[PDB]
Each structure stands twice: as C-alpha cells, then as structure tokens.
C-alpha cells in the first residue's frame, strides 16, 4: 500500500485481508474499496496510534467484540457500504474518544443497532443514512450526551415513540429526509436548530403547548409532503427559514423573525387579510404555481422588508398593490399570468423595483403623460428605479413614443410579439442607459431605430424576423454581438455596416438566404472576428 | 380544481417505486453479481421459453330499477309442440 | 417529535355519513328526498316484497414473482399412437408426469398452469371442448372453447391448473387430455374440423410456480360502520331495508423510498404499503357489493338496486 | 363517466386516481450462472379510474 | 353448468342479457330457451335428471 509520512493509503481494489507487515508508526489508515470480509482483532490491534480508519466499501460482516476497543486514539471510523446486517454480539466496543461514526448503507435493522452501538462519551456526528431502520423507541439511542448531528435520510422510519431523543440533550442538527413518516403530534426538542423533514409522507404538523423552554428552531424543511394546512408556528419564535413547496396547503406575531418563506406548488386559491400582517421582517416570498386569483396587499406597512416576490404561473387577474406598502420590493415576477387591465400607476408606486418580469400577461403600455393612450393601459414611463423589464409574449399590437421615457433600464426584451409595429422614438429615453435589446421573432419588416445613438448598447437580437434594411453605421459602436438569423437580408452592404471591426465579436448569418459572390465585406469579416 | 403537479417529480417517484417493486417481488436483498455469468447470447431453449411467455394468446354509476317477468305457463302450446322429454326441458 | 398514535373515528364516521347521504341522493338522480306524504299508508303489496326478496337473495400471496417452466407433450409414438389412436371425433394429448414433477418439485408450489395449442385451420367456425383422462378407460369434463374463424394461425390457451396439481400428487406416469368437437344429442354426426400442429410447436404446458428456494391497527384496512336510515339519517321514505352495513376504508399508505440494498424483512412492507408502485398510494376499496332498496315515488312503489355500495376489502392504491 | 364506474365517495372520503387494469411482465435474469425466466405481476398500467 | 348435489331447494341463475337485448330489439313473437343434458361424442345419449 502507498506509504507516506504516517499515512498508509491502500489502493482502491485488489485486497482481501488487512496488511500485517506495515509498522504502527502510521497515524491515518484507509481500506476503502477492497474486499475485506471480516475484521479480526489480532492484525488490527497491532496498530496503536490511529486517528482515521476508513473501512468503506467492503464485505465486512463479522467483528470481534473487542476489535476496536484496543485502539486508544481512534478519532474517526467510517463503515459505510458494508454488510453489518448479516452479523456478532458486542459489535463495537465502548469507544474511548470518537468524534465521527459513519454506518451508512449497511442495511441496518431496528434492534440491531441497540445490540451493536455502544456508549461513546464524545460522539459528535452520527450517520445512519441509507439504512433500513423502521422505529425510534426510547431505547434506540442511549448513552451519548455529546451528539450534535444525526443523519437519518433514506430509512423506512414510520413511527417515533415519545422520548426517543431524551438521551441527546445537545442535539442541534437533525435530518429525516426521504423517510416514510406520516404524522407528527408534538415537538419536545428544545435545542434543535436544523430540522429536515423533506420528501416524507407527512400529512399534518404540530408543536407543543405551554412552553417551559423556548424552542430554538431556525431552519425547517417540509417540502414534498402532503400537508393540508399551514402549521401553527407560535412555538418557534426563532424560525428564519421555511420550505412548504409541493404540499397541498390551502389557507382558510408568531413569525416575527421569519426570513425566507417558500410556499410554491401548493393550492393557495386566495390570501387571507391577517396572514400577511404578522409576517413582518420577511425578505423572500414564493407563491409561484399556487392558483392565486388576485394579490391584495393593500394595507399600508405590509411586508416592509420584502425584497422579492414570485407570483408566477398563478392565473392572477388583478393586482391591488397600494402605495408605500412594499417599500423595499426589488425583484418582482409575474410571468405566466393573464393580466388584462390594471391601474396605470400600479408599478409606479414601488419605491425600489428593479426587475419586473411580465411574460405572457398581455399588458400593453400607453403613450405617457402627454399624448395619452387607450384605457386599461399600464404606465412604464415614470419608474426611475427600474433596471430590467421583460415584455415578451404580450401581443403588443402597437408601441408608443414615450412608453419607456423615464426608465433608465439596462435590459429590455420584446421578442415573441407577432404583428408588433414599433413607433418612431419609442426607445427614446433609453439611449444612454439601455444595454441589451431583443426583438427576435416579432416579424417586423423595417427597423426604424436611433441605432447609432445607442452608445451603451452591447448585444442585439433580431432573429426570425423579416428585416429589410438597417440604418447605415457611421462609427465603431460598442455593440459586441448581433443576431440576424432567419432574416430577409440576402446581400449585405459594407459601407452601411461601418466600423463593426473593433468591438464586434459575433455577427450571426446562419439560416439567411445569403448568396455567394455578392457580399465581399462578409468574406473579410468572416476571416477575423466571427464565424457563421 | 387547483393542482400541485410537476410531471418530472411524479416520473421520478414512479421510477424509484418501480426499482423497489422489482427488487421486492423477487425478494432480493441486493442485485446479483454478474462476474461468473457465461458470455454470449442466451441458450435457444431459454429464448424459446421467454418468447412463449411473452406473446399473447387468444385463450354504470346511476341506480337501476328491477323488474320480474314470469314464463308462459305450460297450459298453452308449451307441451303441445315441445313435450318435456327426458332429453330436455323447454321454457 | 412524538408520532401521532391515537385515531379518533367520530369525525371520520360523520364525514362518511354525509358522503353516503350525498351518494344515495346522487345515484337516484333525486336532487332532494322524494315526496313521501302521498303514499297509501299501510302494508306493502306482497308482489313488491316478493320481487325485493328475490333480488336480495344469493344465487349461483400473488404479489411476488413466479418462475416459469415449459414441458412439451410427449411424441405420438409412445402411448398416444396405439390404444388412444386419433380419430375424427377427438385429438389426444398426453404428458409425461416424470418431467412434470421434475419441473415443479412440490404440488403446493404451483400457482397457474395452462395448456397451449396452435390451430392451423382458418375459415370454418367450430365449437370444441376439452376433457381430462380420469383412468385407463374414462374421461371427465373440464371446459369448452368457442373457436373463432380467422385468416392466420393463432395460439390457444386452456386453464388446467387443478388437473396438473392433482397429477403432481396422485397421478400416474403418463396423463393426458382429449380435445373433441361439441356433440349435442340432436347432432347425430359431428367431427373435429379444426387442424392443429403435431397431428414443431407441439402442445405444451406453461407452468408457473414459486421457486423452491423462495418457498417462504393503523394501516389501510376496512373498518365497520353501520348506517341506519331511521336514526343516523332520519329518513322515512325508504321502506326496506331498515339499514345496511356501509363499512368504510381507513388508513394511510406511506410511500416507501426504495434503495438498491435493503433488509430482508423490510421488503415485506412494499407488499402491504405500495403494491402498485404508484407515486402517491391511496387507500381505496377493492371489492364492492350492491344494495337494493324499496322506495316510493308519488303513488307507485319501486324496487331499485344501487350499485357498488358495500365495501368488502381495502387495498393501498 | 366511464372514469366513475367504481366511484364510492362514502368509503375513502378522498377520491384518488388509481390504476384500473394492469399487465404482467416476463424477465430473464442470471442467478450466478443459471438463466431464470420469471413473470412479475401488476407491472404496467393500461387504464385508470377514480376511486 | 355443473349442478352440485343438494338435499334442499336451491336457486340457479344464468346470464342471458345478450339474448334478451336481441329479443327486445328484433325478437320474434315468442322466443324461449331449452335446458338440456350434456351429450358426449361417443354416440351417447343422456337424460336430464334434474327437477324444476
């Protein structure tokens, strides 16, 4: 086996017995991936000073009752991916000082560990994942008052008795993912701080009453279960995380410190008035995919700290966003809905909105304060804090002159808008701020734009269009990438494409009806800078 | 009604359940090793047996009202044209 | 983290009662309970009770996998040809019980055994029946098949599980069947016009038996519930029966997150908690039985059978 | 309406979409060196019902 | 049908829905049935030893 200073890194395969000719001066030993069938006390007790014993991926099935006891300094022991279930008695002797015990994937059984596990007065991280445990009774875990991280995912836990965690007074991180629990009656784990009940089959959740000890839970996960109600969270005043995605929750200051609530893929058909009132100090909210018919955060001072709101794919009809309510909302998502008519200044009242996705909602902007537009419009003009806005798949029949006049946004998308007819000077107040544009698939024919003035423009997207001509370039603008796929251009002038040699790095022509012996300038540009 | 669907989640759960089900029906603690499996295609007898077992062989909500109809008594043309011979009985 | 243990059924029973009331009113297409004051008070006609009594009366470990084995019919030149020579009436098929017992060591292992034929004739329609040899001279009846006309060769399947189990236990060395046309007594002359092979795909048995090496109150289970129209529902417009046993299913069927290696015993949880390997098992009834009632509409009494109302077994998904 | 042929609301209190008809599946797998042909039951789904 | 021996009266029923449907649709003036004893092909006659 490979030998370095106090490390014997045995190779990945080809071993059937523990080597006996190596000296005990080593301190770290590895036996992973070999074909060891059982561990005898004699060759193993020869080594005294060991601090790592990685026995992963073997065929170990029988252990001397006093095999591991003679190792005074054993500080790590991994027995993952073995065959301990076939075992005999005693198993692991009382371990003097072990701070990591790994028994993952040994096909363990309820009542096997209690005859196998011994007292470890310094155990700190226990792992029983990928086993076949089925119950947690009062005698399953005993004599380990230092346990702090218990891993139990991928078991078949279906039932937990009353005091199964009474003998672990200092447990903080617990993990019951991918198990098969079905109900939880109460909660008597004061010091727990990370609880993971994901991917279970839980149907209801509950806590205890008359709290003599303040519960300290902060991280809680309940995704992929079958919860039917929003659990009462007056017994977890320090909760700062929650994940109720893919449940069946229907809604009919206990969370004064909640910080990240996720509530997507549920059945939240409507939002009660008092539900949003107590959820102060929130920063991220996700109501995506929930069937919300309307969002009615009308009360002033509601969600004063909110930084994100996802209302996508809900089939919202209306927004009742009041003024000075969401004073910190920075990112807002509204895609997938069908929003026809809103007050003009719905998005104007927001103080610090930056990104406002409106894909597929069918919301059409209007002219502006002067030269007004049709009724039911939405005013994108007066938002001075916007930076990004996507308006694709909104079927904007007609664009307006000052729809973006006072919105120094650095990114604008308008693709997938068939029959779009763009007014002159529509992108007026964006010349010095707008950096990325997109019009792919509109089907427009002529690009009447103030293109040379878009000094800060970086990339352009005009594919799948019927573009006929473009204003002649007069300088080497900073535009880096240009897209013209599936276009009507068949012969490209060179003088009209003035510059386009320094900054340009990719100018696509693939799929266009270009004809050889008619471009000239294309042959030069293809040679250096961009291909196809 | 409202819905909680994600097709990929259902597909993945179904695939995992299929894995467990196939292992469970054979009462297999762990999948068998293939080290000592002779190479080459299966013996033709095994393939014939598998083909034989594989192919296929030709071998409302709403409540309803009950009514009863008696047979025509043997007093008229029942015994006249079809005597109740020891061979059979007619109705 | 004490898991919920006690189950209280009063709310469950109330929900079941309301659901049953809705089901009863829906199945009859009555948006409301029918008019009752119009009925002629007194005893019911004896004919209606006769009909209701007649309609109310009674007349007339497979989850695991089974190893498959196939045994072919012995060639004609052994026992078939001499004493049981094929005639126009019938075709004789015989099997050697030695290799039969070799395939399935013990009779109790057998789960299903069927006998396969390949018919050659296409057009003529014929009606055929299968017998079993019972001694050196006698025959007995098993079943008959009404062959369908076709244009291509087709295989045939007969279920002969019982006779094969009997052969494995008490049978002699050679046993066989008989395939003869259907002779009504009025049919003086009948012949077997259908042609099958062998008389290269001889008929054979397709034995399925569990292998010898594999020889050996909160879960979903039907729960009793007695519903009374007079007391539980307060209905007087149903005259018979006074009440019926509309027992119901209760129990969760938790999903079992599978692994590539699990304990031997825990595999038995799949069989009773997720047999269908569905993505979200649900405790649903498995066997339903109907209920007939006798209720009045206006002036006329009615005897109606409401279907799929009594729950006999509950199975997860 | 064929989906609701077995609908009994007063038994489960929560109707679920369940398989209605299933078919078996024959497989071939080696136990060490001996080929085995086994037929597993209720493998594929052909139709569904509300119950 | 295979009538098991019995020392008591019993009720037996046959499913004849496919026949009564045709009788209702296009049936004749009077149509009926016939209960007969099984006959083997070996030129054999039988008697109906059942009382109705």
Numbering used by the authors:
A (entry chain I): 26 to 112, 116 to 280, 312 to 591
B (entry chain E): 3 to 61, 73 to 104
C (entry chain F): 1 to 60, 72 to 210, 224 to 240, 261 to 361
D (entry chain E): 311 to 361
E (entry chain E): 156 to 207
Question: What do the study's own words say?
Answer:
Transforming growth factor-β (TGF-β1) is a multifunctional cytokine with key roles in development, immunity, cancer, and fibrosis. Latency of mature TGF-β is determined by non-covalent association with its N-terminal prodomain cleaved by furin during biosynthesis. The prodomain encircles mature TGF-β homodimer in a ring-shaped disulfide linked homodimer “straitjacket”, (latency-associated peptide, LAP), forming L-TGF-β5. Interestingly, both TGF-β1 and -β3 LAPs contain the integrin binding motif RGDLXXL/I and bind to two integrins, αvβ6 and αvβ8, which together account for the majority of TGF-β1, and some of TGF-β3 function, in vivo.
